[PDB]
C-alpha cells in the first residue's frame, strides 16, 4: 500500500 497510497482520499469511517 506504501507503493499505492490513496490515503489521501480515505475516510477514517473504515478501519485501516
Given at each position: ?15 485501516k
Open positions: 500500500d506504501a507503493e499505492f497510497r490513496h490515503d489521501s482520499g480515505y475516510e477514517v469511517h473504515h478501519q
